[PDB]
Amino acid sequence: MFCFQCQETAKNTGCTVKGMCGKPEETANLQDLLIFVLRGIAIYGEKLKELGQPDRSNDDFVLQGLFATITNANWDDARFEAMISEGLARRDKLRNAFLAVYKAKNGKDFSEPLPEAATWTGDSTAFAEKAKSVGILATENEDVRSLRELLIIGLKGVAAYAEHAAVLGFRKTEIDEFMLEALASTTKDLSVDEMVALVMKGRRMAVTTMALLDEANTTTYGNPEITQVNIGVGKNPGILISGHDLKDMAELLKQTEGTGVDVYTHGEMLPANYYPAFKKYPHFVGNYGGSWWQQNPEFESFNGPILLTTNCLVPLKKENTYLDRLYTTGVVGYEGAKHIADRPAGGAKDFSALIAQAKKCPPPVEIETGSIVGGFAHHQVLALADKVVEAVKSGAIKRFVVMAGCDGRQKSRSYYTEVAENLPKDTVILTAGCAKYRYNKLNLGDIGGIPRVLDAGQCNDSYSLAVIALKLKEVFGLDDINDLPVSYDIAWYEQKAVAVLLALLFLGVKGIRLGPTLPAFLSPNVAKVLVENFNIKPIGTVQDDIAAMMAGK
Numbered sequence: 066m067f068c069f070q071c072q073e074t075a076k077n078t079g080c081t082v083k084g085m086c087g088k089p090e091e092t093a094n095l096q097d098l099l100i101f102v103l104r105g106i107a108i109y110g111e112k113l114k115e116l117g118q119p120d121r122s123n124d125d126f127v128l129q130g131l132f133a134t135i136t137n138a139n140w141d142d143a144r145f146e147a148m149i150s151e152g153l154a155r156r157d158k159l160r161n162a163f164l165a166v167y168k169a170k171n172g173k174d175f176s177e178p179l180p181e182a183a184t185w186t187g188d189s190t191a192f193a194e195k196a197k198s199v200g201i202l203a204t205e206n207e208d209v210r211s212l213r214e215l216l217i218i219g220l221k222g223v224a225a226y227a228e229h230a231a232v233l234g235f236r237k238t239e240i241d242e243f244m245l246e247a248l249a250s251t252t253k254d255l256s257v258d259e260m261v262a263l264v265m266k267g268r269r270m271a272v273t274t275m276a277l278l279d280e281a282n283t284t285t286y287g288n289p290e291i292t293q294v295n296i297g298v299g300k301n302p303g304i305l306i307s308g309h310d311l312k313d314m315a316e317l318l319k320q321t322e323g324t325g326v327d328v329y330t331h332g333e334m335l336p337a338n339y340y341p342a343f344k345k346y347p348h349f350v351g352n353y354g355g356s357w358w359q360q361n362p363e364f365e366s367f368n369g370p371i372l373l374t375t376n377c378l379v380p381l382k383k384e385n386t387y388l389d390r391l392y393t394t395g396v397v398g399y400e401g402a403k404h405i406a407d408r409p410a411g412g413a414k415d416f417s418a419l420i421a422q423a424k425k426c427p428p429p430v431e432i433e434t435g436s437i438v439g440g441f442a443h444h445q446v447l448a449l450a451d452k453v454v455e456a457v458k459s460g461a462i463k464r465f466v467v468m469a470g471c472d473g474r475q476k477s478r479s480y481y482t483e484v485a486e487n488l489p490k491d492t493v494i495l496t497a498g499c500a501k502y503r504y505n506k507l508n509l510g511d512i513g514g515i516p517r518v519l520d521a522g523q524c525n526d527s528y529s530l531a532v533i534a535l536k537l538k539e540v541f542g543l544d545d546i547n548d549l550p551v552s553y554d555i556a557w558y559e560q561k562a563v564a565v566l567l568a569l570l571f572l573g574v575k576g577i578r579l580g581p582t583l584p585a586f587l588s589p590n591v592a593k594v595l596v597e598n599f600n601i602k603p604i605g606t607v608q609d610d611i612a613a614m615m616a617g618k
């Protein structure tokens with residue numbers, strides 16, 4: 066196999082026998098073959114748009130297919146075989162439409178050569194062998210490989226955010242058209258300048274898509290507000306919901322009201338505690354446990370059913386006993402785990418089976434007690450603008466440090482905890498995404514009643530951090546966003562974090578520290594281009610980086 070798309074890839078070069086995440090050869094190769102089929106849909110879809118007869122019938126299929134290949138999302142080979150079969154049939158419908166329109170507009174049959182993605186077919190028995198030959202290493206030139214895979218990695222992150230928006234009813238044609246432009250590009254031989262341009266365009270579309278999801282979440286469920294979240298447990302059986310989808314949360318809360326089963330959040334569902342729409346349910350207890358990678362012991366101790374709405378789902382250990390109470394939904398899948406089917410239009414998912422099961426389970430084991438504060442998204446922070454700005458002016462807040470991003474397993478990540486603890490007492494940490502769990506249960510106190518850690522929400526709520534920085538720039542009358550008293554020390558793990566990075570580069574932020582390693586998917590020449598344009602830096606020692614940031618450097 067070959068896969069290099071997350072931070073934990075083997076030796077920082079590539080997983081080649083079995084993924085460090087657990088992904089086996091056969092599953093890794095089926096994901097490659099699905100991306101191959103998606104490029105084939107994109108070739109005809111782009112050509113039909115060119116001829117003035119665009120077809121939007123595959124928009125959701127393309128989003129879900131890219132999302133299913135994100136790290137820790139879907140582990141069920143049968144699901145990939147089904148999507149590959151469906152994708153071939155969708156591609157062939159587009160092919161037939163294109164051939165007829167081409168002939169009508171040109172007065173002859175189309176006769177130009179097309180990439181294999183556009184033509185190959187087989188039944189399911191052919192998939193495993195074909196899959197070996199269509200993967201990342203088929204691109205021989207290392208710099209073309211880096212730029213193609215960088216684009217597809219960023220695109221997957223954008224597609225995940227766009228899928229959440231689409232679930233809530235919010236779509237922009239430009240985003241779905243871009244998916245096809247980008248995928249089709251990876252079958253063409255383009256200049257370096259053209260490939261870099263498409264990566265920057267993806268950063269631009271990450272801004273558009275994060276804006277759309279911010280609008281969808283806040284219009285539907287309200288603006289986030291300051292909230293104290295309980296981290297201990299109650300005395301009823303519960304259901305634990307993980308992942309990122311807020312519409313699944315809204316339906317779960319409604320269906321559980323009055324049943325004597327409590328609801329708890331986990332991981333990137335923490336921010337659901339912050340939304341006005343959800344705060345009105347008494348049986349919504351609080352947040353259980355820590356970061357995604359600690360899930361095996363914590364899902365075990367939770368005792369009740371667990372529902373994964375998105376990544377990250379980690380494979381069970383041999384000793385784990387919770388398979389019979391693990392449920393997947395959306396693009397998530399796992400062999401042997403029960404799957405909750407998609408809602409009909411205008412209707413809702415059916416969670417009745419989880420509720421029935423939970424009534425049979427013991428209450429959760431308590432793993433800690435106390436509370437966390439959060440809810441500082443853009444509406445809430447702008448409401449406090451006078452106070453924050455005032456505090457900057459007196460020098461009580463000397464610097465903001467953005468420590469948003471995504472967490473992971475490696476021991477080097479203690480760097481982020483130790484930075485948080487050793488920053489000076491007149492600084493404030495801005496965060497979003499599961500990187501927060503490295504420091505959100507420390508007591509770092511406050512400055513004048515502003516908490517020293519301000520949690521804006523899920524990784525997608527990095528958008529709020531940009532909106533805040535743009536406003537401060539206007540208030541202080543600076544010509545360049547980079548001259549604000551803000552430093553960026555961002556941790557990454559999977560492809561949504563890459564989309565957030567591309568958005569920050571599109572907005573012109575330079576001097577970002579990215580860690581705890583730099584991506585394996587940057588070749589030397591491509592890394593140079595990003596360094597010289599954007600001044601991205603690796604992390605150093607805790608002491609050395611703190612001194613540097615406090616200096617604006």
Ligand code: SF4
Pocket residue numbers: 068069070071072073074075079080083084085086087088093136137
């Ligand atoms: S998703 Fe990450 S750890 Fe898993 S196979 Fe790919 S690079 Fe390796």
